[PDB]
CSV table of C-alpha atoms in Angstrom, one decimal:
chain,number,residue,atom,x,y,z
I,3,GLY,CA,64.6,111.2,50.5
I,4,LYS,CA,62.3,109.1,52.8
I,5,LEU,CA,59.1,107.0,52.8
I,6,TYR,CA,56.9,107.4,55.8
I,7,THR,CA,54.3,105.0,56.9
I,8,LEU,CA,51.5,106.6,58.9
I,9,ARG,CA,48.6,105.2,60.9
I,10,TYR,CA,45.2,106.9,60.4
I,11,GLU,CA,42.5,106.1,63.0
I,12,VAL,CA,39.6,104.2,61.6
I,13,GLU,CA,35.9,104.8,62.4
I,14,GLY,CA,34.9,102.3,65.1
I,15,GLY,CA,38.5,101.6,66.2
I,16,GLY,CA,41.8,100.5,64.9
I,17,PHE,CA,44.0,102.0,62.2
I,18,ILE,CA,44.7,101.9,58.5
I,19,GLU,CA,48.3,102.5,57.4
I,20,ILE,CA,49.3,104.7,54.5
I,21,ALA,CA,52.7,105.3,53.0
I,22,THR,CA,53.8,108.7,51.6
I,23,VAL,CA,56.9,110.7,50.6
I,24,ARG,CA,54.8,113.9,51.1
I,25,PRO,CA,53.7,114.0,54.7
I,26,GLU,CA,53.0,117.7,54.5
I,27,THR,CA,50.1,117.0,52.1
I,28,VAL,CA,48.3,114.6,54.5
I,29,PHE,CA,46.1,117.6,55.6
I,30,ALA,CA,44.7,117.9,52.1
I,31,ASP,CA,43.6,114.2,51.9
I,32,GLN,CA,40.1,113.7,50.7
I,33,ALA,CA,39.9,109.9,50.7
I,34,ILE,CA,41.9,106.8,51.3
I,35,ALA,CA,41.6,104.6,48.2
I,36,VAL,CA,42.1,100.8,48.1
I,37,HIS,CA,41.7,98.2,45.4
I,38,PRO,CA,38.2,96.6,45.7
I,39,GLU,CA,39.7,93.1,45.8
I,40,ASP,CA,42.2,93.8,48.5
I,41,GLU,CA,41.5,91.5,51.5
I,42,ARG,CA,43.4,93.7,53.9
I,43,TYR,CA,40.9,96.6,53.4
I,44,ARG,CA,37.7,95.3,51.9
I,45,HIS,CA,35.8,95.3,55.3
I,46,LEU,CA,36.8,99.0,55.7
I,47,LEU,CA,35.1,100.2,52.5
I,48,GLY,CA,32.4,102.7,53.3
I,49,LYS,CA,33.9,103.5,56.8
I,50,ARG,CA,35.9,106.7,57.4
I,51,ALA,CA,39.5,107.4,58.5
I,52,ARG,CA,40.6,110.4,60.5
I,53,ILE,CA,43.4,112.6,59.1
I,54,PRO,CA,46.2,112.6,61.8
I,55,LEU,CA,46.4,115.8,63.9
I,56,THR,CA,42.9,117.0,62.7
I,57,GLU,CA,39.3,116.3,63.4
I,58,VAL,CA,38.6,115.7,59.7
I,59,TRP,CA,37.1,112.3,58.6
I,60,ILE,CA,37.5,111.1,55.0
I,61,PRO,CA,35.9,108.1,53.1
I,62,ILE,CA,37.7,104.8,52.6
I,63,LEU,CA,36.7,104.0,49.0
I,64,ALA,CA,37.4,101.6,46.3
I,65,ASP,CA,39.2,102.3,43.0
I,66,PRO,CA,40.8,99.8,40.5
I,67,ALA,CA,43.7,102.1,39.7
I,68,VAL,CA,45.1,101.3,43.2
I,69,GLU,CA,48.1,99.0,43.2
I,70,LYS,CA,48.0,96.7,46.2
I,71,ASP,CA,51.8,96.3,46.1
I,72,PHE,CA,52.6,100.0,46.1
I,73,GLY,CA,53.1,101.4,49.6
I,74,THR,CA,50.7,99.6,52.0
I,75,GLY,CA,48.2,99.2,49.2
I,76,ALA,CA,46.0,101.9,50.9
I,77,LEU,CA,46.5,105.2,49.0
I,78,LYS,CA,45.9,108.6,50.5
I,79,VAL,CA,44.1,110.7,47.8
I,80,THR,CA,44.9,114.5,47.5
I,81,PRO,CA,43.3,115.7,44.3
I,82,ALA,CA,44.8,119.2,44.6
I,83,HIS,CA,48.4,118.1,44.8
I,84,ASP,CA,48.9,115.1,42.6
I,85,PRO,CA,47.8,114.3,39.0
I,86,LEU,CA,47.0,110.6,39.7
I,87,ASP,CA,45.0,111.6,42.7
I,88,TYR,CA,43.2,114.2,40.7
I,89,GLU,CA,41.9,111.4,38.3
I,90,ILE,CA,40.7,109.4,41.3
I,91,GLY,CA,39.0,112.5,42.6
I,92,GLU,CA,37.1,112.9,39.3
I,93,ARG,CA,35.8,109.4,39.4
I,94,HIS,CA,34.6,109.8,43.0
I,95,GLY,CA,33.5,113.4,42.9
I,96,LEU,CA,36.1,114.4,45.5
I,97,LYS,CA,36.5,118.1,46.1
I,98,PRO,CA,40.1,119.3,45.7
I,99,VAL,CA,41.4,121.0,48.8
I,100,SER,CA,44.8,122.7,48.6
I,101,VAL,CA,47.0,123.2,51.7
I,102,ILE,CA,50.0,124.7,49.9
I,103,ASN,CA,49.6,128.1,48.2
I,104,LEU,CA,51.2,129.4,45.1
I,105,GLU,CA,54.1,130.8,47.0
I,106,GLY,CA,54.8,127.4,48.4
I,107,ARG,CA,53.7,128.0,51.9
I,108,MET,CA,51.3,125.8,54.0
I,109,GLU,CA,47.9,127.3,54.6
I,110,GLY,CA,44.5,126.3,55.9
I,111,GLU,CA,42.3,125.4,58.8
I,112,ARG,CA,43.1,121.8,58.2
I,113,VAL,CA,46.9,122.4,58.5
I,114,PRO,CA,48.1,122.2,62.1
I,115,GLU,CA,48.9,125.5,63.7
I,116,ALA,CA,52.6,124.9,64.1
I,117,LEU,CA,52.8,124.3,60.3
I,118,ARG,CA,50.9,127.3,58.9
I,119,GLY,CA,53.0,129.8,57.0
I,120,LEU,CA,56.0,127.5,56.7
I,121,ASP,CA,57.5,126.8,53.3
I,122,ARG,CA,56.6,123.3,52.0
I,123,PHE,CA,60.0,121.7,52.6
I,124,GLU,CA,60.4,122.9,56.2
I,125,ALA,CA,56.7,121.9,56.8
I,126,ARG,CA,57.6,118.4,55.5
I,127,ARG,CA,60.3,117.9,58.2
I,128,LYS,CA,58.2,119.4,61.0
I,129,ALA,CA,55.1,117.4,60.0
I,130,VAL,CA,57.0,114.2,60.4
I,131,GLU,CA,58.0,115.2,64.0
I,132,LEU,CA,54.4,116.2,64.9
I,133,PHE,CA,53.3,112.8,63.6
I,134,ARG,CA,56.0,111.0,65.5
I,135,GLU,CA,55.2,112.7,68.7
I,136,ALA,CA,51.5,112.1,68.4
I,137,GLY,CA,51.9,108.4,67.8
I,138,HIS,CA,51.1,108.3,64.0
I,139,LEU,CA,54.5,107.4,62.6
I,140,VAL,CA,54.7,103.6,62.1
I,141,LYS,CA,57.9,103.7,60.2
I,142,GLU,CA,60.5,105.7,58.1
I,143,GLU,CA,62.6,104.2,55.3
I,144,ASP,CA,65.4,105.8,53.3
I,145,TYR,CA,65.7,105.8,49.5
């Protein structure tokens, strides 16, 4: 129902914005991918971004499959939860990390305490509020 834009802290200061309709999967991110020719992010290639609400840092890498006009043009990559991300993960040797188990519940050290054990849909709603309260929610748009 909604598109969320989140700001992830960038190594050395500043932020990089990512858009997603699956905020609960942010904790499984393994990279942020950008098109190599995208002027907005080229200088960030090789630096790292911190996953909101965690102490996990992931690579900002380049991949030609990224569409500069989709979202912010910076794509969070979660190989375990999306088939397109899985293909990017294979090209870059990313390790799939799942934060949603087979029963549909959130699980994992990377998942914030308040979200563990919740079913995916309830976690999606709560994750948005945790991001909002922590200062990571840049914007929310309705479909």
